[PDB]
Design an enzyme around this catalytic site. Structure first.
Site, PDB file in Angstrom:
ATOM      1  N   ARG A  98      -8.814   7.770  -3.070  1.00 56.16           N
ATOM      2  CA  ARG A  98      -8.193   9.019  -2.637  1.00 56.16           C
ATOM      3  C   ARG A  98      -6.813   9.198  -3.272  1.00 56.16           C
ATOM      4  O   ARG A  98      -5.824   8.653  -2.780  1.00 56.16           O
ATOM      5  CB  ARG A  98      -8.080   9.038  -1.111  1.00 56.16           C
ATOM      6  CG  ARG A  98      -9.275   8.410  -0.394  1.00 56.16           C
ATOM      7  CD  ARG A  98     -10.457   9.359  -0.340  1.00 56.16           C
ATOM      8  NE  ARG A  98     -11.670   8.726   0.186  1.00 56.16           N
ATOM      9  CZ  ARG A  98     -11.939   8.578   1.480  1.00 56.16           C
ATOM     10  NH1 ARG A  98     -11.067   8.994   2.393  1.00 56.16           N
ATOM     11  NH2 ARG A  98     -13.072   8.004   1.866  1.00 56.16           N
ATOM     12  N   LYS A 143     -26.576   8.181   7.083  1.00 53.69           N
ATOM     13  CA  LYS A 143     -25.676   9.236   6.621  1.00 53.69           C
ATOM     14  C   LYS A 143     -25.141   8.919   5.233  1.00 53.69           C
ATOM     15  O   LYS A 143     -24.553   7.857   5.019  1.00 53.69           O
ATOM     16  CB  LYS A 143     -24.511   9.422   7.605  1.00 53.69           C
ATOM     17  CG  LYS A 143     -23.419  10.378   7.126  1.00 53.69           C
ATOM     18  CD  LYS A 143     -22.399  10.659   8.233  1.00 53.69           C
ATOM     19  CE  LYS A 143     -21.363  11.678   7.790  1.00 53.69           C
ATOM     20  NZ  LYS A 143     -20.466  11.162   6.705  1.00 53.69           N
ATOM     21  N   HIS A 151     -20.329  12.771   1.523  1.00 52.06           N
ATOM     22  CA  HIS A 151     -19.173  12.329   2.309  1.00 52.06           C
ATOM     23  C   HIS A 151     -17.992  13.281   2.122  1.00 52.06           C
ATOM     24  O   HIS A 151     -16.841  12.851   2.031  1.00 52.06           O
ATOM     25  CB  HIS A 151     -18.784  10.897   1.910  1.00 52.06           C
ATOM     26  CG  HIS A 151     -18.139  10.104   3.003  1.00 52.06           C
ATOM     27  ND1 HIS A 151     -18.799   9.097   3.678  1.00 52.06           N
ATOM     28  CD2 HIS A 151     -16.891  10.151   3.526  1.00 52.06           C
ATOM     29  CE1 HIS A 151     -17.987   8.569   4.577  1.00 52.06           C
ATOM     30  NE2 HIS A 151     -16.821   9.185   4.501  1.00 52.06           N
ATOM     31  N   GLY A 197     -17.147  18.853   9.675  1.00 51.76           N
ATOM     32  CA  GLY A 197     -16.079  17.869   9.719  1.00 51.76           C
ATOM     33  C   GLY A 197     -14.692  18.484   9.764  1.00 51.76           C
ATOM     34  O   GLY A 197     -14.127  18.674  10.838  1.00 51.76           O
TER      35      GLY A 197
HETATM   36  C1  LIG Z   1     -10.517  12.787   7.388  1.00 47.89           C
HETATM   37  C2  LIG Z   1     -11.973  12.415   7.321  1.00 47.89           C
HETATM   38  C3  LIG Z   1     -12.429  11.223   7.873  1.00 47.89           C
HETATM   39  C4  LIG Z   1     -13.778  10.892   7.808  1.00 47.89           C
HETATM   40  N1  LIG Z   1     -14.226   9.713   8.360  1.00 47.89           N
HETATM   41  C5  LIG Z   1     -15.568   9.391   8.295  1.00 47.89           C
HETATM   42  C6  LIG Z   1     -16.015   8.208   8.858  1.00 47.89           C
HETATM   43  O1  LIG Z   1     -15.216   7.451   9.413  1.00 47.89           O
HETATM   44  N2  LIG Z   1     -17.352   7.886   8.796  1.00 47.89           N
HETATM   45  C7  LIG Z   1     -18.252   8.733   8.169  1.00 47.89           C
HETATM   46  O2  LIG Z   1     -19.449   8.433   8.118  1.00 47.89           O
HETATM   47  N3  LIG Z   1     -17.806   9.911   7.607  1.00 47.89           N
HETATM   48  C8  LIG Z   1     -16.469  10.242   7.664  1.00 47.89           C
HETATM   49  N4  LIG Z   1     -16.025  11.422   7.113  1.00 47.89           N
HETATM   50  C9  LIG Z   1     -16.997  12.350   6.432  1.00 47.89           C
HETATM   51  C10 LIG Z   1     -17.543  13.357   7.430  1.00 47.89           C
HETATM   52  O3  LIG Z   1     -18.328  12.670   8.375  1.00 47.89           O
HETATM   53  C11 LIG Z   1     -18.434  14.403   6.766  1.00 47.89           C
HETATM   54  O4  LIG Z   1     -19.418  13.805   5.950  1.00 47.89           O
HETATM   55  C12 LIG Z   1     -17.658  15.392   5.922  1.00 47.89           C
HETATM   56  O5  LIG Z   1     -16.339  15.522   6.403  1.00 47.89           O
HETATM   57  C13 LIG Z   1     -18.369  16.729   6.068  1.00 47.89           C
HETATM   58  O6  LIG Z   1     -17.807  17.623   5.165  1.00 47.89           O
HETATM   59  P1  LIG Z   1     -16.838  18.799   5.682  1.00 47.89           P
HETATM   60  O7  LIG Z   1     -15.542  18.165   6.120  1.00 47.89           O
HETATM   61  O8  LIG Z   1     -16.617  19.706   4.506  1.00 47.89           O
HETATM   62  O9  LIG Z   1     -17.437  19.567   6.837  1.00 47.89           O
HETATM   63  C14 LIG Z   1     -14.680  11.751   7.185  1.00 47.89           C
HETATM   64  C15 LIG Z   1     -14.220  12.941   6.633  1.00 47.89           C
HETATM   65  C16 LIG Z   1     -12.870  13.273   6.699  1.00 47.89           C
HETATM   66  C17 LIG Z   1     -12.378  14.560   6.099  1.00 47.89           C
HETATM   67  O1  LIG Z   2     -13.716   9.184   4.399  1.00 47.63           O
HETATM   68  C1  LIG Z   2     -13.028   8.579   5.270  1.00 47.63           C
HETATM   69  O2  LIG Z   2     -11.837   8.932   5.494  1.00 47.63           O
HETATM   70  C2  LIG Z   2     -13.640   7.426   6.045  1.00 47.63           C
HETATM   71  O3  LIG Z   2     -13.269   7.521   7.398  1.00 47.63           O
HETATM   72  O4  LIG Z   2     -15.044   7.522   5.964  1.00 47.63           O
HETATM   73  C3  LIG Z   2     -13.183   6.084   5.490  1.00 47.63           C
HETATM   74  F1  LIG Z   2     -13.749   5.100   6.203  1.00 47.63           F
HETATM   75  F2  LIG Z   2     -13.568   5.961   4.209  1.00 47.63           F
HETATM   76  C4  LIG Z   2     -11.674   5.939   5.584  1.00 47.63           C
HETATM   77  C5  LIG Z   2     -10.867   6.227   4.489  1.00 47.63           C
HETATM   78  C6  LIG Z   2      -9.489   6.090   4.584  1.00 47.63           C
HETATM   79  C7  LIG Z   2      -8.917   5.657   5.773  1.00 47.63           C
HETATM   80  C8  LIG Z   2      -9.719   5.365   6.866  1.00 47.63           C
HETATM   81  C9  LIG Z   2     -11.096   5.503   6.770  1.00 47.63           C
END
Ligand SMILES: Cc1cc2nc3c(=O)[nH]c(=O)nc-3n(C[C@H](O)[C@H](O)[C@H](O)COP(=O)(O)O)c2cc1C
Ligand SMILES: O=C(O)C(O)(O)C(F)(F)c1ccccc1
Ligand SMILES: Cc1cc2nc3c(=O)[nH]c(=O)nc-3n(C[C@H](O)[C@H](O)[C@H](O)COP(=O)(O)O)c2cc1C
Ligand SMILES: Cc1cc2nc3c(=O)[nH]c(=O)nc-3n(C[C@H](O)[C@H](O)[C@H](O)COP(=O)(O)O)c2cc1C
Ligand SMILES: Cc1cc2nc3c(=O)[nH]c(=O)nc-3n(C[C@H](O)[C@H](O)[C@H](O)COP(=O)(O)O)c2cc1C
Ligand SMILES: O=C(O)C(O)(O)C(F)(F)c1ccccc1
Ligand SMILES: O=C(O)C(O)(O)C(F)(F)c1ccccc1
Ligand SMILES: O=C(O)C(O)(O)C(F)(F)c1ccccc1
Lengths: 333, 333, 333, 333
Positions: A161, A205, A229, A283
């Site tokens: 990131r 997922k 993701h 999300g």
């Molecule tokens: C800030 C942030 C944290 C996320 N954390 C997780 C996570 O912990 N586990 C996971 O499976 N997906 C995580 N995601 C991905 C979301 O579950 C999802 O796939 C994605 O945000 C959907 O796209 P959208 O934000 O455009 O609606 C995260 C996404 C964001 C933006």
């Molecule tokens: O995409 C994400 O933010 C996530 O929550 O799935 C993660 F696990 F990759 C993440 C990334 C940065 C900090 C904490 C968790």
């Protein structure tokens, strides 16, 4: 608020820049992040006319329970980053709206507390280097009344990131992983271990390849989420919405097929449904609403999305989500 | 530096405008230059999940030797234009990184000196009006320990560089062609003369037509580089990445198939691999790093690229470059 | 001048706005004008390597005579609008460059005077309400030594030029139709009347439909120009370059197939040739050069175009225009 | 005025912002609104040359009567919003121009008064919750001399107009629904009730799916309008012009097939005709002209459109609208 776009601006105002960037950003050049939106915008629906709309319903049955919309709150880590009440505020609003809420492995409030809120909690699992801890999380989730295990399979490690790197972003000390007192790459053997350890439906997922979707069904998954993701893992990964139709055809009713990435309106929900999805995950917009106005903000978001879904379905001649899945689409420019 | 784009800005600052233009520019309207990037950005990877990643390796075997990445430094003339240490700085960093370095016919440091640095030196050949001088260069390169002859076949003469013409750009007198004390168009007869004169693998750089790739294999080439010379030769020439898949299919394992043009990240390397390439060449970014910080700059670039390649491969479920070549792709917008 | 784009800016400076608009503009929203350029920019050439380039020649034989390039000056009315010497300056430069010049029905210098300049004059015919005047023009042209009749077939009447309407543009009184002391729609019967009245090859300019190209051959035409009149007639008409390949295939060597619209470089000439064209016409750029520097300006333009054509052909591995027609192309974005 | 674009600017000046927004806006993100224009701009016509144009006519026969152009004024509610004379001004101009005018259910002048103007009035029907009122409107329209019932079938309810919501737009109290002293979703049973209640041709407006077009013919419709309601109903609905060709093929002459959405010139009319349409509807531009200059404004608009249609048809080699329907098209970028 008359659209989800109203919320993003509100959230940008109130959030520290580094935290908004953590939420908004993707990996690498953010090609896959942008592509999620571009891909949806290219899809046009071919609506049907003159059908009976006396009892339009947006409800679906999924993983044994009725949901008010073909939609669930996506797993998003550390929600106290966006608002003091964090996951509790979102879970309460989701409960009230009849929408499943996905509790994260990295929730900033313990999964037991979030589950106590009620509603339809699902639990998202990250595979841990110590396997026993991962299977313990699964047991905890099931004991607390979670209804599905959402096994995230596209994070062998976190993506790169660049926003976070440039900001030198780190968790504020007032935000912790409340389920703990680290990651390991998951494999198909990990999936089998989870499946053997629970009676709950296991949902994979982060599936994008057609043969991975096939194998998911063969592995006994109750569902998959077609997903890159949110553009946060492999930069250059195809959007889920571009693979959805092919995957739905390949699994041929063998499991539920969800999609996420860039869903920003009821019209977007209709597009996903028309392409074959059982339901979508949302999300970032849920986090915008949380940041902007806490529990009431999320409630307003879900009410808006509910009205937009009903509107879109009716205008397209669909009295049910099943009818919406039989709509045809056309690619545009 | 967290991306290659960081380096370009740094190089623009320190370099004289005329020299940055020599490096950055293409021929004609620079249509092919831009198209190299556009073509890569349209490619999306379909990643695989849940595979064993316990020993992810980015190493390949090519032309008899192990390389640390599926990547080599492209031939770039007169590198003292960008930094006082010129080719020696780049070669040292490439050696340390386990990446092949391509010594140029028009190097501003003699090929013997660059080869003495060690590592995996390849030698790029321009065909000369006096044929005997060209075959002598080949002999010199082989004697000095070069491992491959990269015969550039898309420069019967230099293209029309409008930036250079407008700047009235000329070599500063402190930069010379150190291998000499001029060009002739190469033909298939020239290739045969080279092949008969050396035991080293001959690699034809600048192949774009499928039948030229076939003929290259028939001619005994050990490899080809699918390439439009970074948009610097024929303006309007198709990008190599657009021809790569068709060419890989046509040669059917008969020689190594490399590609270059616009590779700017590990994700781009993954795309090229997924389309069938054995390895990529990287040109301008290596010169950005050289201009910005000499040997240490190039070292940092190669370390960054190495991490990005590993990251991309793992996120796509590939434990080896061979696995990455079996990935599928999808064209986007 | 190192590109044709240099000339346009020079011409914009010196010309009155109303006259530059007459030259630059198209009909309607100028969709077809823009599309001529967009269509060329989407075409990429697949160059060939390692071929014999010892005697690269850009010459062609067309309508009985050798030309120095696969190119002719397009018919452009009232050239005294752009420079005092008007058609004489352009014709002299074209003669010197070995390129055919197309004398217009609406030339601001008489066709006999322009023909007296020498070179390879062709004559462009507009069909007149009085048919006898049109056949008299043909006889005049043949008597004066013109080598081909370019019968313009896409102007039953002039298109709607919104720039001209907005400017209230009209011919200055110092510019006249020197061949006269009005238009009627042409039909296939008109073509037959012309063909029966002359031994010169008849070339139908403004053909876009495949079956019109077929019928042209059946009607005894010696050539056609695939053309939407530089976007000046039907707004929304397909670019000629988009129809060229299909038309070349349909006529199967039965007549010469020329194309025009947006040719702005030697690379563009190569693209047209690779798509199957015998030769191109160039219109507006010749007028830019005329406006900018009279006869010497046009000479410089033709010298530049000649070098660009040779360069492009050689870089693409073509020793002759015939070889260039056998090149393959690929559509891009 | 030399183009329809001239009128829009004039209308923007004179109209209150809230009213211009009501006119200009679409639903949701206005994706379908924009797509109507994008879709037309991608269509290119392949014109025919050298055909007889001695008696070019733009006239068509439709629903029993001759019309001067293949065009009708689209139903647009509450036209007194744009000018004091409202529907009477537009109807008078349409009458004078020989173009059918569509009287709205929600007209701000009674349908009897508008019909008294003369000309070719059609009547647009919205289905009402009280069915008897809807059938009474149909009877009123027929008694008043309307020649066709345009049954709007894509408005089970009004779409979500975000401009209107943001403006808090409401009808000024000086504008009323003059036909009354509310909506119900229409079904195929509603269509049958209308068909059984009138001898007038029934035209279903808002058809986009091929099978809905087929069913329309089976249901006894005399025509359909292929339409996404100017992007004002389902946001993300495909443009009618993208479905037109497929629908024309499917109904195989079984009813008239009209199209609307983004028609802004005679060239656009030609494109629609070439894709198979019997005629087009024009909506917003007629209201621009009304706002800008009342009856005389609309007259000028229709005169301009008439000249543009004749021009386009002739330049494309079409002496009749029937000939224009046999033109081929090509998609561009
Ligand atoms: C800030 C942030 C944290 C996320 N954390 C997780 C996570 O912990 N586990 C996971 O499976 N997906 C995580 N995601 C991905 C979301 O579950 C999802 O796939 C994605 O945000 C959907 O796209 P959208 O934000 O455009 O609606 C995260 C996404 C964001 C933006
Ligand atoms: O995409 C994400 O933010 C996530 O929550 O799935 C993660 F696990 F990759 C993440 C990334 C940065 C900090 C904490 C968790
Ligand atoms: C300044 C410069 C000099 C180059 N010199 C040579 C050369 O001498 N021989 C050669 O075969 N290619 C030469 N190339 C082309 C590169 O080898 C390579 O094909 C191209 O730069 C790769 O594209 P990239 O720069 O986008 O990575 C040169 C490129 C540049 C930018
Ligand atoms: C100002 C101007 C005048 C023209 N006059 C004629 C003409 O009299 N007869 C004709 O057949 N074409 C005429 N043309 C069209 C050209 O012959 C040619 O088809 C077109 O200009 C080629 O496109 P280009 O200008 O982009 O090179 C004219 C074009 C322009 C710009
Ligand atoms: C302000 C406005 C009001 C409209 N009212 C109606 C209506 O009452 N009934 C109907 O069938 N269509 C209605 N339409 C849609 C038009 O009939 C037509 O489908 C559309 O405007 C054509 O697209 P165009 O405006 O781009 O030409 C309305 C459109 C606008 C812009
Ligand atoms: O593309 C290049 O810069 C080249 O090194 O391949 C070259 F040989 F064409 C060249 C061009 C200009 C100056 C020196 C060398
Ligand atoms: O496109 C032209 O300008 C033309 O020369 O072909 C013409 F005949 F249509 C014309 C148009 C306007 C003025 C003079 C001639
Ligand atoms: O699209 C329209 O404006 C309409 O006239 O068809 C309508 F009925 F949907 C409408 C919408 C808002 C206000 C009045 C009528």
């Amino acid at each position: 608020y008359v659209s989800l776009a109203d919320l993003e601006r509100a959230a940008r105002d109130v959030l520290p820049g580094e935290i908004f960037d953590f939420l908004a950003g993707g990996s690498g050049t953010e090609a896959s992040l942008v592509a999620n939106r571009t891909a949806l915008e290219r899809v046009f629906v071919i609506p049907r006319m003159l059908r009976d709309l006396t009892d339009v319903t947006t409800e679906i049955d999924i993983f044994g329970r009725r949901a008010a919309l073909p939609m669930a709150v996506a797993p998003v880590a550390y929600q106290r980053l966006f608002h003091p009440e964090g996951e509790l505020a979102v879970a309460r609003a989701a409960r009230d709206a009849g929408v499943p809420y996905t509790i994260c492995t990295l929730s900033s409030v313990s999964l037991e507390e979030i589950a106590a809120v009620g509603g339809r909690p699902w639990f998202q699992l990250f595979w841990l280097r110590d396997e026993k801890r991962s299977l313990d999380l699964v047991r905890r989730a099931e004991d607390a009344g979670c209804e599905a295990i959402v096994f995230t399979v596209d994070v062998p490690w976190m993506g790169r990131r660049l926003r976070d790197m440039r900001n030198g972003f780190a968790l504020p000390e007032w935000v912790t992983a409340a389920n703990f007192d680290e990651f390991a790459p998951a494999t198909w053997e990990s999936v089998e271990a989870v499946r053997a350890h629970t009676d709950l439906p296991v949902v994979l997922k982060g599936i994008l390849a057609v043969e991975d979707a096939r194998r998911a069904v063969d592995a006994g998954a109750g569902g998959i989420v077609v997903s890159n993701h949110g553009g946060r893992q492999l930069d250059g990964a195809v959007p889920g919405i571009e693979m959805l139709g092919e995957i739905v055809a390949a699994v041929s009713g063998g499991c539920e097929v969800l999609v996420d990435g860039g869903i920003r309106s009821g019209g977007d929900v209709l597009k996903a449904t028309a392409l074959g999805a059982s339901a979508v995950l949302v999300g970032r917009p849920v986090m915008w609403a949380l940041a902007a106005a806490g529990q009431d903000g999320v409630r307003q978001l879900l009410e808006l999305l509910a009205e937009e879904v009903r509107d879109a379905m009716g205008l397209a001649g669909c009295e049910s989500v099943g009818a919406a899945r039989r709509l045809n689409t056309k690619l545009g420019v």
